[PDB]
Amino acid sequence: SKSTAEIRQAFLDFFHSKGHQVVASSSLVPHNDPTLLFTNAGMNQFKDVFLGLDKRNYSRATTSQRCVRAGGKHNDLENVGYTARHHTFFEMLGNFSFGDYFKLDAILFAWLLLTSEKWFALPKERLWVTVYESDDEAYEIWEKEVGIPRERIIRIGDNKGAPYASDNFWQMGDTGPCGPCTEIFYDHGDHIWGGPPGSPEEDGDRYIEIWNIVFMQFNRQADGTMEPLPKPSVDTAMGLERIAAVLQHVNSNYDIDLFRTLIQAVAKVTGATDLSNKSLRVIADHIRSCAFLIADGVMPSNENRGYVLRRIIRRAVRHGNMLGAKETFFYKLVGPLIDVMGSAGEDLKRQQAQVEQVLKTEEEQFARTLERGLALLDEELAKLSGDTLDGETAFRLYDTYGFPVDLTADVCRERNIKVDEAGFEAAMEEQRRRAREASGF
Numbered sequence: 483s484k485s486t487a488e489i490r491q492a493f494l495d496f497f498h499s500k501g502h503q504v505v506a507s508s509s510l511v512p513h514n515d516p517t518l519l520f521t522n523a524g525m526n527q528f529k530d531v532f533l534g535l536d537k538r539n540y541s542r543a544t545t546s547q548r549c550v551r552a553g554g555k556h557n558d559l560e561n562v563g564y565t566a567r568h569h570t571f572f573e574m575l576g577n578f579s580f581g582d583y584f585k586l587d588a589i590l591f592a593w594l595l596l597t598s599e600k601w602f603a604l605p606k607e608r609l610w611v612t613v614y615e616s617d618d619e620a621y622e623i624w625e626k627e628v629g630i631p632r633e634r635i636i637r638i639g640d641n642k643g644a645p646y647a648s649d650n651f652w653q654m655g656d657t658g659p660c661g662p663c664t665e666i667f668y669d670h671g672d673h674i675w676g677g678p679p680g681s682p683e684e685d686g687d688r689y690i691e692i693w694n695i696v697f698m699q700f701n702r703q704a705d706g707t708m709e710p711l712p713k714p715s716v717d718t719a720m721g722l723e724r725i726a727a728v729l730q731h732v733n734s735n736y737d738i739d740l741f742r743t744l745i746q747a748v749a750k751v752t753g754a755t756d757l758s759n760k761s762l763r764v765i766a767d768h769i770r771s772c773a774f775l776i777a778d779g780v781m782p783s784n785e786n787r788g789y790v791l792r793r794i795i796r797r798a799v800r801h802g803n804m805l806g807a808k809e810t811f812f813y814k815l816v817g818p819l820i821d822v823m824g825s826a827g828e829d830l831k832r833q834q835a836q837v838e839q840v841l842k843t844e845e846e847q848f849a850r851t852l853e854r855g856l857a858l859l860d861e862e863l864a865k866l867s868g869d870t871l872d873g874e875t876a877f878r879l880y881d882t883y884g885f886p887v888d889l890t891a892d893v894c895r896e897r898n899i900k901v902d903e904a905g906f907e908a909a910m911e912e913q914r915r916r917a918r919e920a921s922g923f
């Protein structure tokens with residue numbers, strides 16, 4: 483089968499042959515978008531093009547964009563290790579139309595690449611599509627132009643409990659370009675639990691969302707109002723790891739060539755032997771987000787972007803502790819990561835030494851309190867009455883041991899214990915009041 487690198491290149495070659503300008507991945511950190519924590523989509527760097535504020539010499543483009551979804555509008559951190567399809571760091575294979583082609587040709591391009599004998603040649607019968615309920619045009623295209631049997635065309639409304647809150651209406655964030663979308667799903671088979679989109683078991687890993695095609699129509703405002711974009715446009719993204727799983731005839735993203743090699747490296751540095759352990763997958767994912775974030779300029783801190791990075795690093799180190807790592811290990815994964823990322827890791831390779839030192843320093847710093855904090859958490863859980871850890875304890879782990887509350891919740895989750903978030907926040911607010919009282923005016 484094709485490697486992840488070959489699949490990335492094949493996608494770009496396809497759209498290039500269809501007249502799309504190949505544009506390099508942007509950084510994970512925007513310089514000119516205050517509404518954006520980390521790059522969470524291929525379209526981010528073209529946001530102003532969609533808004534009609536920026537013009538390019540090309541009207542159609544294709545990228546393989548590195549994305550991190552660990553905060554803001556799109557945050558999958560808590561899904562990592564619990565599904566076979568969610569990462570913090572991942573690549574979007576995208577094509578874009580800036581007032582060029584629209585609905586029909588976007589769908590045809592995607593179907594052709596996916597199903598043509600000349601290209602990816604996926605079995606058509608295992609492909610399902612969803613459309614926004616009101617998008618009669620998209621429904622007709624799949625049914626009559628493409629020829630998907632009606633039983634595999636699913637209409638999805640505002641299933642998230644609010645106007646425009648839908649799996650088939652994509653939004654960059656609370657503000658920004660948005661519009662109705664159509665998604666392509668692949669059925670991995672009855673050996674995997676799950677039902678098709680729209681069904682009660684849709685959240686299973688059986689029917690995987692591979693490719694989302696957005697018909698950009700509006701610019702959302704802070705108040706929630708939709709203002710029409712100057713030109714209806716197209717924003718698409720196929721998950722590289724997810725299509726790689728399909729093409730390499732495996733079911734989990736973590737079973738693709740990239741992750742198989744990376745997980746082996748994690749086992750090597752932690753001393754783990756059970757290659758099926760959940761923590762190995764978590765660490766493999768976390769090194770990708772952490773290493774690339776540092777390469778793109780993020781430094782660990784206790785505020786904003788730096789704190790999200792610190793939280794992910796420390797959670798990764800914690801998982802290494804559960805696997806029984808005897809020494810500093812996380813920074814040792816930068817090399818192996820560069821080795822599996824191909825051309826998509828060039829920015830990381832350029833700064834390998836710097837990234838390694840940052841991760842080494844951060845792990846050593848956290849090691850000063852990690853085992854001691856875990857010992858306290860064990861002590862408190864052993865005598866805990868009920869299914870919820872008190873907020874005072876979560877706060878003490880935060881204040882004394884530097885345990886972010888989500889790191890503490892992560893450990894407790896593994897033992898079917900919840901954390902009193904309201905209690906933690908109350909404790910944090912009490913401390914802020916003490917600081918204000920002591921500092922004065």
Ligand SMILES: C[C@H](N)C(=O)NS(=O)(=O)OC[C@H]1O[C@@H](n2cnc3c(N)ncnc32)[C@H](O)[C@@H]1O
Nearest residue numbers: 523558568569572691692693694717718719721
């Ligand atoms: C196209 C639109 N701008 C967009 O971002 N759509 S999307 O949110 O659905 O993401 C595009 C694709 O990336 C993949 N993807 C999204 N989140 C992911 C995650 N947390 N981990 C791995 N892949 C993800 C899925 O294949 C998804 O269809």
